[PDB]
């Protein structure tokens, strides 16, 4: 607990840019693309007001559009007079991927017709298209193979406080060990993280801060309409914050919280608000109506685990279950606790052979061990109970491929 | 119930079945079978023939049966076992876990086949476990898989009885003969004996 993330002071003009959404749609062969930027403002509305979205490729200015506020007619009452959408054309765009993180710079300027800048906001833009088609998860038209891992924001000395250095370190290690994706288990990550994954090249699963695995049944809260509000905000506020990052390719509704109506409601919300990304959720059996991807956790390669209500089918058998057609990517597999990862090769053998077995996310990146000191003042790795904490869950907080200090296992 | 149509000897295998000039001859071997046996309850599936690639004629005749008799599914392994001329993925000799990526007409692991992008049909091998001589090894693996996968609904072993003929030596004693044993040539050795039982119905 406490204030574990940066505290800032931001000054905005009275007449300001209150929000902007960046979208990129392409033709079938990705030779052309249209960048669409919806901009919303606050303050005094005036005709002399203008918004100019310009796309930059390095020092070059690939495209630029300007227009006054006043959106298109959306219903019988008219439209948003406090909004405007710019659409820029882009020929032969440099596509973004974890392989080649090609980025552009989108600069949103709030100004007056006579050319006076009021304020400007910006973001990195990555031209990439994510879509599930014919049972396959496609990134720019090609079917992905997620070589991912789950990563908790953990520091052996700073607790759950992140810093650029620790982040960049992890990212390098990951890419160095042939990883291309990460799952923000199990909450939105520190803002800098997305920026790094954007530039370094990593597919990200942005996951809402919602886990109630302790309830009984697991969906006692998520199915209760009384809790729809609290959940709603943990999903919607994540989307409104990170929706512009190209590294974010999938939205997750949270973790271990059974499958309640609330999940379905929020699932549909994201789909309405942001069609650009698939939504997934493993709760309730990994293949519920609240997920676009069959995302089990720890489902074995050939062996079935016929648990009642929420069985874990052999990933290979799962894909062909009557009626099923979705792509399957484990949200968690290969529990790397201690001397583990045995049978890991079997998973990949299968991933490569089955078109719709598109990978998974190992569990997990780093050991959640904390540093304590003995009488002599020497440091040592501590876990469950080592702090008088009780009840505690022994050493189950150490499931990483690397030790708290990022030393490989 | 399978129509009398096999042209495996042609090159490519569908040289005749894709030629409209042969649509008539084929048509009659399909339609006359249906008109004859369509009332038998034991007949649950109609087959368009065997080893004859995949020509337009197959598609035409496929649709005919579907129009004439909606009560039964139609199947055909020609052209890759999953063509537009079959309601069932019916490969022949496709292995359980191992793929055999032949060009044009590969034989995917039956388990991998069911989940291929877009695929949704049920899979029943029209021929598997070639029981030629001391064979049927790995048979248990097929069943292990049939039971675990809902859409892996079985198959048809190949085959029932040895196609051996009886000849007699100088003394007048009978013995089982096969390819070539009748001066027949060219012949294909003993490949006519692939049964689970000998010509005289004695179990193997
Ligand atoms: Na695959
Ligand atoms: Na854990
Ligand atoms: Na079955
Ligand atoms: Na034979």
From Swiss-Prot, chain A:
Sequence positions that bind substrate: 256, 332-335, 399
Protein residues bound to Mg(2+) 1: 211, 213, 256
Binding site for Na(+): 396, 399
Up-regulation conditions: By allolactose.
Record GO terms (molecular function): alkali metal ion binding; beta-galactosidase activity; carbohydrate binding; identical protein binding; magnesium ion binding
Effect caused by changing residue 335 to E/F/N: Poorly reactive with galactosyl substrates. Less stable to heat than wild-type
GO BP field: lactose catabolic process
Oligomeric form and interacting partners: Homotetramer.
Name of the featured protein: Beta-galactosidase
Gene transcribed to yield this protein: lacZ
Full protein segment contained here: 207 to 615 of 1024
